[PDB]
């Protein structure tokens, strides 16, 4: 939803996560992308625990 | 989980009552009173487990009588360890110093 | 006990640490560093040529 | 720069997993900080960690404090008073942790 509001499409590939669009992604959008990826990986780690 | 570190050690079977388990230990050194501890070396790693505990005279004297010579207790410096085993119930199988 | 599970989880976090080298942001930073150093190498090569 | 960014990302992540442990364990600041430094050094250089060499070693466990721990040691030897530091043998070399 945040990416769509930013004008970019979210392309999920499981653990790997990236944004497809013209030129570099917005800085705040990139930061939120990294935070969401880290949160998903933390969910995976807590899932293993 | 290795099966060697979690298996009971056969110390002594029952002597079937009469006659009582009577052990005479003229050589009362610590290995022969409190028993021995061995190590198995597989691919050069010194490992020990419960199954490698050799019973001593004390262990096979349970329920019976342990006959000792006072000369050996006094001479071998094992009187203190023996009285500590009797008073504190501490019987530790001796192991080589290295 | 709680410190024990915490330390066990942190030790298990090695797999995730290996995974993190394939994240979008770290890979993007690596690509930017590669671009900078290749630009320096290319200007040196241009001068020498 | 590759090594530096790997270390930076490793520390940046480990910070957010370590604040909860910092809050839970206020006295374990030194141990947790050392473990984070070890994980960052793993990230930047790459020497595998030893699970038994980076795990806390319980020494005493307190049940209820009443009665206070009565430790009667009739055989007051240096290994039995101050503790023993065991060693492993790997083909003849004495390693410990």
Automatic annotation (TrEMBL), chain A:
Q: List membrane-spanning regions.
A: none
The protein's superkingdom reads: Bacteria
Q: Which family, according to the similarity comment?
A: Belongs to the peptidase S16 family.
Q: What is this protein called?
A: endopeptidase La
What organism does the record attribute this protein to? Meiothermus taiwanensis
Top-level taxonomy: Bacteria, Thermotogati, Deinococcota, Deinococci, Thermales
This chain is encoded by the gene named lon_2
Which residues of the complete protein appear here? Answer: 148 to 196 of 719
